[PDB]
Target: Peptidyl-prolyl cis-trans isomerase FKBP5
Amino acid sequence: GAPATVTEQGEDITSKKDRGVLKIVKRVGNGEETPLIGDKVYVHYKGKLSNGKKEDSSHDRNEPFVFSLGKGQVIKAWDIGVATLKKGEIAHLLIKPEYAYGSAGSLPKIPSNATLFFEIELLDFKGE
Ligand SMILES: COc1ccc(CC[C@@H](OC(=O)[C@@H]2CCCCN2C(=O)[C@H](c2cc(OC)c(OC)c(OC)c2)C2CCCCC2)c2cccc(OCC(=O)O)c2)cc1OC
Model:
């Protein structure tokens, strides 16, 4: 499925080049600018456990998910991955646990050593 396609075709966007965060651009965005640390970022997303069975989406609440980029407000893979997106871009991320919840997990929601998959649409971003 989509996770396997990211393994096969995804770009390694980690600094260590350990393939811990792999990305496919599914829809190209506009212009050249990508968000800076501190920017208010607005996204729609769907996230799941790649193996396990748990599913989460901002469409559930039918409102965008908002966070400040690069402040450790979200898992490391998002700070890394969303920084590489343009406005209007949709991307797939496959995320190994080292860039998510690691060995601790976040039980009951997230098991230990879990791989996560997300589809993320970057709606907009703004300086404060
Ligand atoms: C720096 O590390 C962390 C920082 C924050 C967290 C909490 C989960 C953090 O979620 C995440 O970082 C990732 C990426 C963003 C969308 C949500 N997300 C999740 O994993 C989802 C998620 C969604 C949640 O509710 C919306 C969670 O409840 C807080 C949650 O808790 C562990 C996890 C998963 C749900 C199961 C299926 C796979 C996805 C979170 C959730 C809701 C709002 C958040 O920030 C907005 C703000 O604070 O205004 C941050 C975990 C962190 O690492 C373990």
